[PDB]
Design an enzyme around this catalytic site. Structure first.
Site, PDB file in Angstrom:
ATOM      1  N   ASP A 194       2.372   5.710 -32.022  1.00 32.38           N
ATOM      2  CA  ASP A 194       3.817   5.601 -31.858  1.00 32.38           C
ATOM      3  C   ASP A 194       3.989   5.345 -30.361  1.00 32.38           C
ATOM      4  OD1 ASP A 194       6.546   5.612 -32.050  1.00 32.38           O
ATOM      5  OD2 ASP A 194       6.739   7.632 -32.845  1.00 32.38           O
ATOM      6  N   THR A 220       1.923   5.213 -24.122  1.00 34.78           N
ATOM      7  CA  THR A 220       0.933   4.731 -23.194  1.00 34.78           C
ATOM      8  C   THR A 220       2.042   3.737 -22.919  1.00 34.78           C
ATOM      9  OG1 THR A 220      -1.464   4.756 -23.426  1.00 34.78           O
ATOM     10  CG2 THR A 220      -0.407   2.641 -23.318  1.00 34.78           C
ATOM     11  N   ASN A 226      -8.836  -3.541 -31.402  1.00 31.64           N
ATOM     12  CA  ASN A 226      -7.528  -3.966 -30.954  1.00 31.64           C
ATOM     13  C   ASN A 226      -7.572  -4.450 -29.518  1.00 31.64           C
ATOM     14  OD1 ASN A 226      -6.023  -2.117 -28.831  1.00 31.64           O
ATOM     15  ND2 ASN A 226      -7.361  -0.763 -30.026  1.00 31.64           N
ATOM     16  N   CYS A 244      -4.324  -4.906 -28.024  1.00 33.97           N
ATOM     17  CA  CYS A 244      -2.869  -4.832 -27.939  1.00 33.97           C
ATOM     18  C   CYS A 244      -2.328  -5.206 -26.570  1.00 33.97           C
ATOM     19  CB  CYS A 244      -2.387  -3.428 -28.324  1.00 33.97           C
ATOM     20  SG  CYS A 244      -2.565  -3.058 -30.083  1.00 33.97           S
ATOM     21  N   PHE A 247      -1.214  -2.853 -24.076  1.00 26.61           N
ATOM     22  CA  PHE A 247      -0.131  -1.987 -23.622  1.00 26.61           C
ATOM     23  C   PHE A 247       1.265  -2.490 -23.992  1.00 26.61           C
ATOM     24  CE2 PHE A 247      -2.800   1.023 -22.158  1.00 26.61           C
ATOM     25  CZ  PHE A 247      -2.983   1.266 -20.802  1.00 26.61           C
ATOM     26  N   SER A 269      -8.048   2.132 -21.093  1.00 29.32           N
ATOM     27  CA  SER A 269      -7.773   1.035 -22.010  1.00 29.32           C
ATOM     28  C   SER A 269      -8.633  -0.146 -21.586  1.00 29.32           C
ATOM     29  CB  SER A 269      -6.311   0.609 -21.949  1.00 29.32           C
ATOM     30  OG  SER A 269      -6.121  -0.552 -22.748  1.00 29.32           O
ATOM     31  N   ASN A 290      -8.092  -3.175 -22.615  1.00 29.15           N
ATOM     32  CA  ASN A 290      -7.270  -4.360 -22.823  1.00 29.15           C
ATOM     33  C   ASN A 290      -6.340  -4.700 -21.664  1.00 29.15           C
ATOM     34  OD1 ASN A 290      -7.006  -3.140 -26.196  1.00 29.15           O
ATOM     35  ND2 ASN A 290      -8.499  -4.596 -25.360  1.00 29.15           N
ATOM     36  N   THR A 291      -6.496  -3.987 -20.556  1.00 25.79           N
ATOM     37  CA  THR A 291      -5.698  -4.232 -19.360  1.00 25.79           C
ATOM     38  C   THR A 291      -6.663  -4.441 -18.195  1.00 25.79           C
ATOM     39  OG1 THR A 291      -3.741  -2.989 -20.055  1.00 25.79           O
ATOM     40  CG2 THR A 291      -4.122  -3.207 -17.680  1.00 25.79           C
ATOM     41  N   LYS A 315      -7.461  10.305 -19.850  1.00 28.87           N
ATOM     42  CA  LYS A 315      -8.173   9.755 -20.990  1.00 28.87           C
ATOM     43  C   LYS A 315      -9.274   8.839 -20.468  1.00 28.87           C
ATOM     44  CE  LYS A 315      -7.541   7.748 -25.556  1.00 28.87           C
ATOM     45  NZ  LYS A 315      -6.557   7.497 -26.647  1.00 28.87           N
ATOM     46  N   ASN A 321     -11.642   6.817 -25.340  1.00 30.83           N
ATOM     47  CA  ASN A 321     -10.619   5.877 -25.700  1.00 30.83           C
ATOM     48  C   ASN A 321     -11.524   4.990 -26.553  1.00 30.83           C
ATOM     49  OD1 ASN A 321      -8.747   3.625 -25.678  1.00 30.83           O
ATOM     50  ND2 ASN A 321      -7.879   4.557 -23.835  1.00 30.83           N
ATOM     51  N   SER A 328     -11.051  12.558 -29.423  1.00 35.05           N
ATOM     52  CA  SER A 328     -10.520  11.346 -30.008  1.00 35.05           C
ATOM     53  C   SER A 328     -11.679  10.409 -30.281  1.00 35.05           C
ATOM     54  CB  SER A 328      -9.538  10.678 -29.056  1.00 35.05           C
ATOM     55  OG  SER A 328      -9.063   9.470 -29.612  1.00 35.05           O
ATOM     56  N   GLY A 329     -11.750   9.887 -31.500  1.00 34.75           N
ATOM     57  CA  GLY A 329     -12.823   8.978 -31.839  1.00 34.75           C
ATOM     58  C   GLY A 329     -13.534   9.274 -33.147  1.00 34.75           C
ATOM     59  N   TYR A 380      -6.184   8.685 -35.233  1.00 36.72           N
ATOM     60  CA  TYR A 380      -5.535   7.390 -35.234  1.00 36.72           C
ATOM     61  C   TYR A 380      -6.088   6.670 -36.455  1.00 36.72           C
ATOM     62  CZ  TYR A 380      -3.208   3.123 -33.876  1.00 36.72           C
ATOM     63  OH  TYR A 380      -2.347   2.041 -33.897  1.00 36.72           O
TER      64      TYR A 380
HETATM   65  C1  LIG Z   1      -3.970  -0.400 -32.566  1.00 32.57           C
HETATM   66  C2  LIG Z   1      -4.380   0.682 -31.554  1.00 32.57           C
HETATM   67  C3  LIG Z   1      -3.591   0.929 -30.443  1.00 32.57           C
HETATM   68  C4  LIG Z   1      -3.933   1.943 -29.459  1.00 32.57           C
HETATM   69  N1  LIG Z   1      -3.116   2.169 -28.367  1.00 32.57           N
HETATM   70  C5  LIG Z   1      -3.458   3.107 -27.485  1.00 32.57           C
HETATM   71  C6  LIG Z   1      -2.622   3.391 -26.316  1.00 32.57           C
HETATM   72  O1  LIG Z   1      -1.567   2.787 -26.085  1.00 32.57           O
HETATM   73  N2  LIG Z   1      -3.053   4.350 -25.482  1.00 32.57           N
HETATM   74  C7  LIG Z   1      -4.260   5.119 -25.646  1.00 32.57           C
HETATM   75  O2  LIG Z   1      -4.547   5.957 -24.828  1.00 32.57           O
HETATM   76  N3  LIG Z   1      -5.030   4.862 -26.728  1.00 32.57           N
HETATM   77  C8  LIG Z   1      -4.683   3.926 -27.612  1.00 32.57           C
HETATM   78  N4  LIG Z   1      -5.471   3.686 -28.700  1.00 32.57           N
HETATM   79  C9  LIG Z   1      -6.697   4.495 -28.848  1.00 32.57           C
HETATM   80  C10 LIG Z   1      -6.529   5.731 -29.728  1.00 32.57           C
HETATM   81  O3  LIG Z   1      -5.563   6.634 -29.122  1.00 32.57           O
HETATM   82  C11 LIG Z   1      -7.850   6.521 -29.866  1.00 32.57           C
HETATM   83  O4  LIG Z   1      -8.335   6.983 -28.554  1.00 32.57           O
HETATM   84  C12 LIG Z   1      -8.973   5.675 -30.474  1.00 32.57           C
HETATM   85  O5  LIG Z   1      -8.451   4.810 -31.518  1.00 32.57           O
HETATM   86  C13 LIG Z   1     -10.060   6.556 -31.043  1.00 32.57           C
HETATM   87  O6  LIG Z   1      -9.565   7.322 -32.124  1.00 32.57           O
HETATM   88  P1  LIG Z   1      -9.891   6.973 -33.634  1.00 32.57           P
HETATM   89  O7  LIG Z   1     -11.391   6.695 -33.720  1.00 32.57           O
HETATM   90  O8  LIG Z   1      -9.515   8.239 -34.358  1.00 32.57           O
HETATM   91  O9  LIG Z   1      -9.086   5.752 -34.041  1.00 32.57           O
HETATM   92  C14 LIG Z   1      -5.148   2.689 -29.684  1.00 32.57           C
HETATM   93  C15 LIG Z   1      -5.941   2.422 -30.830  1.00 32.57           C
HETATM   94  C16 LIG Z   1      -5.600   1.456 -31.767  1.00 32.57           C
HETATM   95  C17 LIG Z   1      -6.518   1.252 -32.969  1.00 32.57           C
HETATM   96  C1  LIG Z   2      -4.537  -1.705 -38.555  1.00 34.12           C
HETATM   97  C2  LIG Z   2      -3.613  -0.712 -39.220  1.00 34.12           C
HETATM   98  O1  LIG Z   2      -3.705  -0.803 -40.579  1.00 34.12           O
HETATM   99  C3  LIG Z   2      -2.766   0.191 -38.613  1.00 34.12           C
HETATM  100  C4  LIG Z   2      -2.600   0.345 -37.186  1.00 34.12           C
HETATM  101  N1  LIG Z   2      -2.451   0.447 -36.056  1.00 34.12           N
HETATM  102  C5  LIG Z   2      -1.911   1.125 -39.456  1.00 34.12           C
HETATM  103  O2  LIG Z   2      -1.165   1.910 -38.818  1.00 34.12           O
HETATM  104  N2  LIG Z   2      -1.983   1.082 -40.800  1.00 34.12           N
HETATM  105  C6  LIG Z   2      -1.462   1.924 -41.756  1.00 34.12           C
HETATM  106  C7  LIG Z   2      -0.382   2.866 -41.518  1.00 34.12           C
HETATM  107  C8  LIG Z   2       0.069   3.654 -42.553  1.00 34.12           C
HETATM  108  C9  LIG Z   2      -0.474   3.584 -43.848  1.00 34.12           C
HETATM  109  C10 LIG Z   2       0.100   4.496 -44.925  1.00 34.12           C
HETATM  110  F1  LIG Z   2       1.104   4.131 -45.143  1.00 34.12           F
HETATM  111  F2  LIG Z   2      -0.447   4.154 -46.040  1.00 34.12           F
HETATM  112  F3  LIG Z   2      -0.128   5.638 -44.698  1.00 34.12           F
HETATM  113  C11 LIG Z   2      -1.552   2.655 -44.103  1.00 34.12           C
HETATM  114  C12 LIG Z   2      -2.025   1.840 -43.048  1.00 34.12           C
HETATM  115  O1  LIG Z   3      -2.585  -1.033 -25.820  1.00 36.89           O
HETATM  116  C1  LIG Z   3      -3.790  -1.241 -25.896  1.00 36.89           C
HETATM  117  O2  LIG Z   3      -4.404  -2.333 -25.986  1.00 36.89           O
HETATM  118  C2  LIG Z   3      -4.833  -0.132 -25.868  1.00 36.89           C
HETATM  119  C3  LIG Z   3      -4.736   0.898 -24.999  1.00 36.89           C
HETATM  120  C4  LIG Z   3      -5.785   1.933 -25.012  1.00 36.89           C
HETATM  121  O3  LIG Z   3      -5.771   2.887 -24.267  1.00 36.89           O
HETATM  122  N1  LIG Z   3      -6.799   1.745 -25.952  1.00 36.89           N
HETATM  123  C5  LIG Z   3      -6.896   0.679 -26.847  1.00 36.89           C
HETATM  124  O4  LIG Z   3      -7.839   0.610 -27.631  1.00 36.89           O
HETATM  125  N2  LIG Z   3      -5.876  -0.276 -26.797  1.00 36.89           N
END
Ligand SMILES: Cc1cc2nc3c(=O)[nH]c(=O)nc-3n(C[C@H](O)[C@H](O)[C@H](O)COP(=O)(O)O)c2cc1C
Ligand SMILES: C/C(O)=C(\C#N)C(=O)Nc1ccc(C(F)(F)F)cc1
Ligand SMILES: O=C(O)c1cc(=O)[nH]c(=O)[nH]1
Ligand SMILES: CCCCCCCCOCCOCCOCCOCCOCCO
Ligand SMILES: CCCCCCCCOCCOCCOCCOCCOCCO
Length: 371
Positions: A71, A92, A117, A119, A121, A188, A190-191, A234, A263, A310-311, A333
């Site tokens: 979010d 973020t 991803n 993205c 920021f 991140s 991506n920046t 982070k 991250n 996280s991860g 996430y």
């Molecule tokens: C689509 C996407 C957007 C993310 N955006 C951010 C972000 O804005 N800031 C941040 O600190 N991490 C961001 N993350 C990283 C997550 O907060 C988390 O550190 C990472 O996905 C590892 O957790 P997971 O393995 O449970 O997904 C993002 C990850 C995804 C997949």
């Molecule tokens: C790549 C991706 O699928 C996401 C991101 N970011 C995501 O939030 N997906 C996602 C979010 C919510 C749901 C549900 F509604 F079912 F709970 C399923 C997929």
């Molecule tokens: O916004 C993003 O691209 C982003 C930020 C971050 O901290 N981690 C990531 O995987 N994406």
């Protein structure tokens, strides 16, 4: 089945559909929209007092929160928390709103429950997000089921910003008053150039600047803690041992309140569907790497710096591994992406069961038990 319950089978049918046919970011935005309009299921169970945890005065009712990026603009904090999470790290955010990189920039690989991803920021900006958080705080103030929920704010730098500290200070001044903690995002991938801020020298300056700015900011704290926001940093898991050790020393010197371990990673290339994709990888393939990273930092910091994991956390087992490695709390996430709305209720139940099975009287007892 109780239709208001995150476990209601209908949500799994939705989950299957989304995962099978819907673009990653489109689905994500749709989900946030569902939450914004408050038509998402919610967890009605009471959290086990045996699974509560904390990072100083930061008291989490349960060990599961949603990681930064889910979010980004804090558009549906309430709805996401009510899924059963004890906290959420919004944004973020950057001082100014920016669009992020070209789409599509989010891809899933269900087989390996991984995500990648780039993205960039993308967020509406500190001004707008602050308004969203403020609205939440006011809402939290009239609701009581949210009084103990925690909201952290992740902050970074705009794409062209030269000195990151300038952006961090701006965001803190605007939203710091409504945050329970601040997450300095210097990991991140991506920046361009952002990760260089992990260099001991720069990171030290950044952390001190953040702490001072928070003190310089200081009814006062319109957050949950009623205290100034803690400071977390982070880190990217793509650091060498030397780098990690230097950072570990900085975190101790700067007396940072906590460290969000890992991250996304850039060292994963064994995922077929991601070969032609850029960005950081999240999910199952990041679990061991980040868990190991936690082990190291926990040691390198002499178990003095609370860790937020996280991860690749999907199950209670994964959470316990993070916890026993030194983590005090977990952030999800990818789990939300692959397990859907039942994510929180499910992982909490699994962890409670596992903690009981293993013979722990509470979650805290498990923190670092892998010593
Ligand atoms: C689509 C996407 C957007 C993310 N955006 C951010 C972000 O804005 N800031 C941040 O600190 N991490 C961001 N993350 C990283 C997550 O907060 C988390 O550190 C990472 O996905 C590892 O957790 P997971 O393995 O449970 O997904 C993002 C990850 C995804 C997949
Ligand atoms: C790549 C991706 O699928 C996401 C991101 N970011 C995501 O939030 N997906 C996602 C979010 C919510 C749901 C549900 F509604 F079912 F709970 C399923 C997929
Ligand atoms: O916004 C993003 O691209 C982003 C930020 C971050 O901290 N981690 C990531 O995987 N994406
Ligand atoms: C309109 C009804 C479609 C029904 C499809 C039935 C598939 C049977 O799977 C039963 C178990 O599903 C449990 C919920 O899982 C949600 C996540 O599914 C992951 C992908 O599953 C692929 C196989 O369906
Ligand atoms: C492996 C193939 C799977 C095919 C699945 C077809 C699934 C179609 O999904 C429709 C059901 O999802 C229900 C929507 O629930 C999410 C939002 O709830 C808000 C209230 O919506 C009520 C009207 O649907």
């Amino acid at each position: 089945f109780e239709s208001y319950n995150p476990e209601f089978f209908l949500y799994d049918i939705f989950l299957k559909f989304c995962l099978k046919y819907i673009d990653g970011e489109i689905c994500h935005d749709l989900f946030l929209l569902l939450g914004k309009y408050n038509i998402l299921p919610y967890d009605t169970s009471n959290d086990s007092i045996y699974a509560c945890t904390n990072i100083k005065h930061l008291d989490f009712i349960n060990p599961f929160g949603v990681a930064a990026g889910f979010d980004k603009n804090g558009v549906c904090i309430d709805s996401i928390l009510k899924l059963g999470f004890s906290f959420i790290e919004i944004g973020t955010i950057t001082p100014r709103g920016q669009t992020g990189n070209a789409k599509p920039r989010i891809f899933r690989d269900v087989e390996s429950r991984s995500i990648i991803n780039s993205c960039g920021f993308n967020n509406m900006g500190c001004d707008k997000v602050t308004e969203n958080l403020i609205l939440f705080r006011k809402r939290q103030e009239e609701d009581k089921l949210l009084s103990k929920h925690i909201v952290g704010v992740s902050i970074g730098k705009n794409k062209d910003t030269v000195n990151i500290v300038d952006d961090l200070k701006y965001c803190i001044n605007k939203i710091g008053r409504y945050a329970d903690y601040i997450a300095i995002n210097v990991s991140s991938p991506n920046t361009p150039g952002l990760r260089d801020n992990q260099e001991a020298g720069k990171l030290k300056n950044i952390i001190l600047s953040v702490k001072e700015e928070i003190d310089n900011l200081e009814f006062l704290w319109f957050n949950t803690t009623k205290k100034k926001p803690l400071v977390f940093v982070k880190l990217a898991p793509d650091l060498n041992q030397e780098q990690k050790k230097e950072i570990a020393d900085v975190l101790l010197e700067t007396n940072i309140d906590g460290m969000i371990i890992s991250n996304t990673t850039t060292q994963i290339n064994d995922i077929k569907s991601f070969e032609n994709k850029k960005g950081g990888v999240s999910g199952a393939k990041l679990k061991d790497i980040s868990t190991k990273f936690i082990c190291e930092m926990y040691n390198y910091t002499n178990k003095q710096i609370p860790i937020i994991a996280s991860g690749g956390i999907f199950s209670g087992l994964d959470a316990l591994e993070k916890i026993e490695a030194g983590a005090s709390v977990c952030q999800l996430y990818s789990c939300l992406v692959f397990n859907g709305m039942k994510s929180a209720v499910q992982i909490k139940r699994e962890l409670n069961h596992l903690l009981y099975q293993r013979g722990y009287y509470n979650l805290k007892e498990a923190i670092g038990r892998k010593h």
